[PDB]
């Protein structure tokens, strides 16, 4: 929490930061946001100002959430094109190169395939939460007909005391007090459930998202440990390149251990 | 590997998929790429036919990569108001969920600041793969003189073999063969090393970003496990709530666990 | 499998072609497909909208097995007919080369009876498949009424629960249920076993047809190492040519050994 615990808009220093200093911000961060046009501030807009007061927010939440999970889709299908790329290119070139990338783009090709099944959970977690958006959005009207019935008592009596419309507007408004003591309790029952549950999904989706990429980039490492490396001088000829074998064990062991994952059997351990 | 080893476009079964059935595919997936209009299309075309044929290809995966790395810009800017709009609609509620909800929207504002590294660490490695690009482009012309060179000996060969040029254009050839000999053997020396150091400095970006986002969506869950439900009837009232210095400490902890961990410190250890 | 694990499009090194380069692409490959005009297409089109939906499929896999047969029979009389070309062409030249091209061309000759051998049990296996394709066309019209049934009942349900057609409608609908209890098992009982016998009839005369293809090949080129070769020089007269009882006794051993082979003495041990 760098802007929390200083002024400062820049970022402390850490025990990675001690380690290696920081990089250099991105150099291709335009001003202009081109944030796909003007479709996405329609979509945030005029989400807010249609419906019930009450559930306006929560229309809002659902639409921004939709257009993040939007985005890792487009992110994750340019990975992939990338991977296709780079293995394209690996082929017009040595034999140590043109399997090490082959090998390289096949393990990076399975970040979108992760990040498919991430965005699904996603998508439930949204169409949890825009079931608690409907059913305030729901609820709201009988509070809104109570203070509408309240203040036409209040007003009717200021008019005159002598109306004979006073007794069955009182009753009216009981009727209406006691439709509310229900209905409050029933809005609040399962708020408290549902939200509790969505985030429990969407915090275990995450960390099985996360260890996944984290043991597949490890072998990744381990297969590119293998590339060996030295300097030649001219006329001199590399010795032939014999390690098929061994990337195949590699990437057999990558499969092996990803298919046999599961959540109980999760490797990192919180304090 | 679901698509290379079946010709089956679905999903195998696993021991996740065997544990809960996969979710539903989501809704929220157009036919129409809506790839930020025809922007992308021509920065992808435009630079494959421009420049020397031998670098063509990595001109194409370092624009690629440049797309990558803008969309996820957009996907933590996204992630980061979506926090905010939660916090902000959380207050008008109960005491316990004011506070739980800004505590959530605190602990997911930092997936942006991580992304921020992840993002200057990918453009690091999107310009040590261009200076590749850069050295094979200058390399290419060499050789194209040499053929021209070795082309127009053998024409005037047949043209006449009386011409006093074969000399002048042999001692050429010779010369042109000497520099390209040399040639060869500094442009295969660098690539080997700047290919591997690029990919691993990825992988290790990689590894430190799901390591830190893993742990966060822990202490999350951990968080959010004392939030307290059970159903209440009509008429009643809930408890006071009083669980505020435990999400201090909680958040405290968080923010220590983040300082702390290092790199030679890695909870994952692949197999 | 050089597709399935490497995004290349190309053929990986294998034993094979370490010993020997694989050969270039056969110049005659055009672009355009020329599949026998549009009949092919028409055929596959066609069969596959005009039936029960549940027997779509196995329709077009038998058209398609139908074309896939029709081909091998072309194919075979064209390879019939050069084996008679080159026996006619042989004729006049060297003692030596109108006997060997003729014994060549009698052992080509006997590619085509392999073939329509083949051909008739790849019939015999189409028509096998075909049987299935039947039986479960002729099942789903059975779930088809009782699912319109299910229907009828939901709708009426709603429309009027006074009606007097509950009780006529609830005792149709269980005896639909009980009708297709026992559809469904005879359905699944025969597929199991229909194919498996289909493919064990198809793999065993493939097993046959190549056992034999290799046993005439390789006895054509124990005959052809008799053929003698040697450099003439100009004026040279080539000594009589005296070898006409040696290939008679190796064709009568082609015989002999393709009529005494049987299937339980097949030479090939897969491990
Ligand atoms: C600076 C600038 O004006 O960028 C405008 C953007 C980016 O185009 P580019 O990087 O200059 O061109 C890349 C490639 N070399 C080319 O010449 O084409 O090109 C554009 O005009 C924006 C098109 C969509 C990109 C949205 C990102 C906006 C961030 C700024
Ligand atoms: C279906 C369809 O045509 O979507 C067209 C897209 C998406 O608009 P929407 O989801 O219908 O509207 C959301 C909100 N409820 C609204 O009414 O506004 O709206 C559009 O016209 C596309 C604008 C940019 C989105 C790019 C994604 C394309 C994927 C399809
Ligand atoms: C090239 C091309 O256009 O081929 C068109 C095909 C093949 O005719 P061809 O090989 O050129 O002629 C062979 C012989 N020397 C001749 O002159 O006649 O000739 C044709 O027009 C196609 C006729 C049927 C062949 C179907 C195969 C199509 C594959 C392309
Ligand atoms: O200043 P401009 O007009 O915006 O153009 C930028 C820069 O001047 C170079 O043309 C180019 O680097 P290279 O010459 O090395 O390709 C870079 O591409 P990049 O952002 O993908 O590196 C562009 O963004
Ligand atoms: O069919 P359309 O015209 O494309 O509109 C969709 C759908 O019909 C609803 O209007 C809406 O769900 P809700 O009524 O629940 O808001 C949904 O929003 P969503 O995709 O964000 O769920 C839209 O995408
Ligand atoms: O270019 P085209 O018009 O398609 O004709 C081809 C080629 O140019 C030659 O005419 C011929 O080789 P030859 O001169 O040696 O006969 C060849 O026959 P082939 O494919 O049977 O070899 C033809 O396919």
Redesign the interface.
Known sequence: ??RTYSLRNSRAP???QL?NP????????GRFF????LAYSFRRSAAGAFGPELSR??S??VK????????????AN??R?????????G?E??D??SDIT?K???LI??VS?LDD?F??????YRLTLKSIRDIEGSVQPSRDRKDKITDKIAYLKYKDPQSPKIEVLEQELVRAEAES??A???L??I???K??AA??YQ??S???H??K???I??????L?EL?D?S??????TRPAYDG?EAS?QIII?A?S?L?????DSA?????
């Not at 081109?34 to 046009?37: A, L, N, S, V």
């Not at 921004?64 to 992110?75: A, H, Q």
């Not at 094109?81 to 290119?89: N, T």
């Not at 298919?259 to 959540?263: A, K, P, Q, S």
């Open positions: 929490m760098h850490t025990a990675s380690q920081p990089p250099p911000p991105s150099t291709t961060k081109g944030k796909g046009g927010k929560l809002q939440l921004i959430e939709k257009n993040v999970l939007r985005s890792m889709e487009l992110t340019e990975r094109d990338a991977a296709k790329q780079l293995s394209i290119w082929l070139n040595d140590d190169v082959d390289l783009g096949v090709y399975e395939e099944q965005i699904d959970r996603y998508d439930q003591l229900v409050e309790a029933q609040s029952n708020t408290r459930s939200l509790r985030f429990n915090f275990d995450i960390i099985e996360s260890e990429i984290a043991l980039a490890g072998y990744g490492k381990a590119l590339l490396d300097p030649v001088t001219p006329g001199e098929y195949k062991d499969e251990a298919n046999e994952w599961t959540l490797q990192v351990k919180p304090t």
